[PDB]
Design a protein around this ligand. Structure first.
Ligand SMILES: Cc1cc2nc3c(=O)[nH]c(=O)nc-3n(C[C@H](O)[C@H](O)[C@H](O)COP(=O)(O)O)c2cc1C
Ligand SMILES: CCOc1cccc(=O)c2c(C)n(Cc3ccc(Cl)cc3)c(C)c12
Ligand SMILES: O=C(O)c1cc(=O)[nH]c(=O)[nH]1
Length: 371
């Protein structure tokens, strides 16, 4: 458990972004990635309704787009993973190279364009994992969510989301509505109050309709054994009117949680990304995101639980997001810049910090900045 850091520093030096991405998914495919069977702190526990996370750290969407590494990635010490984003039909995505990193600022820029094997192939992989999960006592508590979007040419999102829910809904602990991507035009236009309310109610109605089509209680082949929760992933690039307008919709529609936030197209302060096009992740996104959690946690009057992402690399970064209003933390660029150690390390720092600040448990620290 050092060999990986020689590999990582070398990878970050001479190897392309997507080659590392396809290399990491290769190691976990043949299950040759390290384990973390070490028991997690009971004071570091968190939840979103019936969704009970062993620790507050999971993997963001876009890491395991196709769910070919679910068990492998979880075993690194994460409580959950968000597979996808997935679309009804598979897509090659946008032109390569399309993933670039600036080590100096710990940032990433990407124009992937929902590259996936399609909803049907990803479902095939999730059913495989859920089958492994039954036999296994270790992955019995690990949560697996699915991020759903639309094919580039889909003239109406709703139809594309109605298809994915009917296919993969049965095997997800939660569904994440992806209306925040900056690399598939113009998905962000769906963040308008009217459009978003129709999306959220259509999705929730489809989930309800799965049950209303059989006597099987057997029906839920997930971790919770309950209907998936419905979450919405939001872009940080919004004005205050747009944010308040959304808040009022999330309250009326009774959305289960909100993933604040996706990548940002506001950053122009990176030299290595000047020519490049896409959304910016990592450390340069941290300050924006924490400010956006505050705004939304105040706008939804603390009623809608939050999943934070990103710019999370340390235990302080984690506690910052939690004190702002978030219940869980998703990681992405941390896994790119710290590698395999990521979970094990971030989990140590947070327990060390939770004690240092004067907390009995994580829950007690949630939204602490608001007072
Ligand atoms: C290469 C790449 C691909 C991504 N693909 C997706 C995706 O399919 N779905 C999604 O919801 N977010 C996607 N994201 C955004 C992440 O889920 C995450 O919200 C973002 O990277 C911010 O987290 P971080 O600063 O901790 O990295 C992607 C990010 C990167 C770097
Ligand atoms: C599965 C997603 O993979 C990634 C995505 C983006 C950029 C990269 O270049 C990535 C890098 C450097 N890494 C870290 C990594 C990659 C490969 C190895 Cl062998 C060890 C660590 C991941 C997981 C990366
Ligand atoms: O695959 C992509 O294009 C993608 C999706 C998303 O939500 N965010 C991102 O930065 N890239």
């Amino acid at each position: 458990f050092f060999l990986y850091d020689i590999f990582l520093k070398f990878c970050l030096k001479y190897i392309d972004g997507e080659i590392c991405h396809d290399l990491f998914l290769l190691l976990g495919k043949y299950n040759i990635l390290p384990y973390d069977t070490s028991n997690d702190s009971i004071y570091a526990c968190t939840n979103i309704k019936h969704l009970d996370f062993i620790n507050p750290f999971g993997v963001a969407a876009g890491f395991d787009k196709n769910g070919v590494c679910i068990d492998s990635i979880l075993k690194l010490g994460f409580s959950f993973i968000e597979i996808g984003t997935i679309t009804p039909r598979g897509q090659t995505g946008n032109a390569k190279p399309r993933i670039f990193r600036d080590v100096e600022s710990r940032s990433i820029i990407n124009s992937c364009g929902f590259n996936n094997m399609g909803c049907d192939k990803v479902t095939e992989n999730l059913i495989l994992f859920r089958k492994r999960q039954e036999e296994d006592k270790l992955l019995s508590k690990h949560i697996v969510g699915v991020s759903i979007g639309k094919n580039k040419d889909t003239v109406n999102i709703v139809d594309d989301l109605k298809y994915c829910i009917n296919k993969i809904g049965r095997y997800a602990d939660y569904i994440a509505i992806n209306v925040s991507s900056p690399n598939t035009p113009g998905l962000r236009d769906n963040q308008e109050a009217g459009k978003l309310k129709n999306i959220i109610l259509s999705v929730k109605e489809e989930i309800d309709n799965l049950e209303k089509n059989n006597i099987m209680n057997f029906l839920w082949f997930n971790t919770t054994k309950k209907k998936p929760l419905v979450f919405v992933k939001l872009a940080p690039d919004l004005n205050q009117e747009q944010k308040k307008e959304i808040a009022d919709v999330l309250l009326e529609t009774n959305i289960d949680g909100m993933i604040i936030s996706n990548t940002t197209t506001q950053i122009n302060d990176i030299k290595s990304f000047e020519n490049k096009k896409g959304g910016v992740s990592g450390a340069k996104l941290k300050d924006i995101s924490t400010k956006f959690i505050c705004e939304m946690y105040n706008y939804t009057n603390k009623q809608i639980p939050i999943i934070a992402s990103g710019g999370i690399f340390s235990g302080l970064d984690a506690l910052e997001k939690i004190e702002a209003g978030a219940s869980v933390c998703q990681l992405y660029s941390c896994l790119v810049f710290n590698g395999m150690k990521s979970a094990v390390q971030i989990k140590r720092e947070l327990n060390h910090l939770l004690y240092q600040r004067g907390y009995y448990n994580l829950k007690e620290a949630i939204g602490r900045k608001h007072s």
